[PDB]
Amino acid sequence: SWDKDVYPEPPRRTPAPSPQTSLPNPITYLTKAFDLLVDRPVTLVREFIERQHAKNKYYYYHREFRRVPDITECHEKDVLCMFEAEMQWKRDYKVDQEIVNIIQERLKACQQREGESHRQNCAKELQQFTQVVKAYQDRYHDLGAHYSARKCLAKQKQRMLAERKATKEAA
Amino acid sequence: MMTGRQARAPLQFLPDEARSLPPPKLTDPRLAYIGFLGYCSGLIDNAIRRRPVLSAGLHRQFLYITSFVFVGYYLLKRQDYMYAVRDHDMFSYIKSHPEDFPEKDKKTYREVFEEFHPVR
């Protein structure tokens, strides 16, 4: 199972079979054959496997990371704090990458699910993809292969300086 | 360098200040490496005189590694003493002249400015 909220799916509406001709379609017969010959043995084997699982149950946990001070409250050339800030920034970088991957999965799933009318029915997914791509590009792009927290901070400082200059020239 | 330091009491291998330092252990890795140097010397001495290199003259190899360990231990004692002297003199000069070594502020990265050069 997964989470229906972070991986949404619109409600399904299957129309009822209302045949017109008297010829029996082979799809129903092959579906019955698949349900008899294939589905029941696989279900029985999986039920036996789950019964064997239920005797010995053990848990694995999601690792929780507490918050450490970031690079903006680290002194210059003091490794014992910029180290922790750097690793926290790397973990946040990976989390952001997987967030963009989740949004890409949402967009592709919407495009394939909605069929030939995908241009109108998936505007929200496209706008969320555009917003998250703009945020990712403004946050992490053009850092280089040797990226660090200091390079991202310098890029952000340049961005706010340019924004302040632009809003000063317009007022 | 420290020649004037070796001016009042010259030609001393280990002065009276060298005894306040902890002596190196007998299981020092450098001492083991010098013993291995002595073993290699014994092997070469057996080899260059057409002797069986792993059997001939075990007493010779034992004296080789023993003399090597002896000289290496004393040289390591002198090296540790000299490095302690260097550190002590440096710290004494730093303490003696506070105006020549003034403390500098540690500005956080929220205040300092770094230029960003994009890679593209």
- Number of residues written out for chain A: 171
Q: What is the largest CA-CA distance in chain B?
A: 74
How far apart, in whole angstroms, are the C-alpha atoms of residue B73 and residue B27?
11
On the 0-12 / 13-18 / 19+ scale of CB atoms within 10 A, A114 is: middle
Chain B residues touching A143 at Cβ < 8 A:
119
How far apart, in whole angstroms, are the C-alpha atoms of residue A106 and residue A131?
14
Mutate to test the interface with B, among A70, A75, A81, A159 (most CBs of B within 10 A): A75
Token match 């450490």: residue? A68
In degrees rounded to 5, what are phi and psi of residue B70? -60, -55
Min Cα separation A34/chain B (Å): 55
Per-residue tokens: B109:
């990265």
Asked if A146 and A159 touch (Cβ cutoff 8 Å), the reply is: no
Beta carbons within 8 Å of A112's beta carbon, 6+ residues apart:
A118
- Helical axes A123-140 vs A149-169, angle rounded to 10°: 110
Taking the CA atoms of A154, A157, A161 and A167 in sequence, report the sign of the dihedral they define. Answer: positive
Per-residue tokens: A28:
């129903």
Q: Give the number of beta-carbon pairs within 8 Å between A and B.
A: 41
Asked if A150 and B109 touch (Cβ cutoff 8 Å), the reply is: yes
Taking any CB pair shorter than 8 Å as contact, residues of chain A touching chain B are 71-76, 78, 82, 142-145, 150-151, 153-155, 157-158
Residue B115, in any domain of the structure: no
Mutate to test the interface with A, among B105, B106, B107, B116 (most CBs of A within 10 A): B116
Please, how many CA atoms are within 13 Å of residue A121, restricted to the half-sphere of its CB?
13
- Domain extent for B31: 1-97
Of B114, B119, B120, which has the smallest distance from its Cβ to A154's Cβ? B114
Residue B113, in any domain of the structure: no
Q: How many domains in chain B?
A: 1
| Residue A161 parent element (H or E) | helix A149-169
Per-residue tokens: A96:
């952001």
How far apart, in whole angstroms, are the C-alpha atoms of residue A49 and residue A42?
10
Report helix, strand or coil for B10.
coil
Identify how the structure was determined: cryo-EM
In degrees rounded to 5, what are phi and psi of residue B108? -70, 165
Instruction: Give Cα A80 distance to the centre of its chain.
Output: 33
Residue B104, in any domain of the structure: no
How far apart, in whole angstroms, are the C-alpha atoms of residue B120 and residue B109?
25
In degrees rounded to 5, what are phi and psi of residue A75? -70, 160
Taking the CA atoms of B48, B49, B53 and B59 in sequence, report the sign of the dihedral they define. Answer: negative
Residue B105, in any domain of the structure: no
Among A102, A126, A129, residue whose Cα is nearest residue A114: A126
Which region, left, alpha or beta, applies to residue A142 given φ > 0 means left and ψ of -120 to 50 means alpha? Answer: left
Min Cα separation B1/chain A (Å): 31
Encode A30-64 in three state secondary structure: HHHHHHHHHHHHHHHHHHHHHHHHHHCCCCCCCCC
Per-residue tokens: B13:
């291998």
Mutate to test the interface with B, among A82, A88, A146, A151 (most CBs of B within 10 A): A151
How far apart, in whole angstroms, are the C-alpha atoms of residue A87 and residue A148?
9
Report helix, strand or coil for B108.
strand
Per-residue tokens: B85:
């002297």
Min Cα separation B100/chain A (Å): 21
Residue B102, in any domain of the structure: no
| Residue A164 parent element (H or E) | helix A149-169
Asked if B39 and B63 touch (Cβ cutoff 8 Å), the reply is: no
Per-residue tokens: B34:
């010098």
Which region, left, alpha or beta, applies to residue A123 given φ > 0 means left and ψ of -120 to 50 means alpha? Answer: alpha
Per-residue tokens: B65:
């590694």
Of B110, B113, B120, which has the smallest distance from its Cβ to A72's Cβ? B110
> Quick one: closest CA in B to A158, which residue?
B116
Among B17, B64, B14, B28, residue whose Cα is nearest residue B43: B64
How far apart, in whole angstroms, are the C-alpha atoms of residue B66 and residue B48?
21
DSSP state letters, A63-102: --------GGG-BTT-HHHHHHHHHHHHHHHHHHHHHHHH
How far apart, in whole angstroms, are the C-alpha atoms of residue B62 and residue B42?
8
Instruction: Give Cα B89 distance to the centre of its chain.
Output: 17
- Judged by CB atoms closer than 8 Å, whether chains meet at A157 and B113 is answered as yes
SS3 content of chain A, % helix, strand, coil (to 5): 65, 0, 35
Q: What is the largest CA-CA distance in chain A?
A: 84
- Fill in the DSSP letter of residue B16: G
How far apart, in whole angstroms, are the C-alpha atoms of residue A5 and residue A1?
12
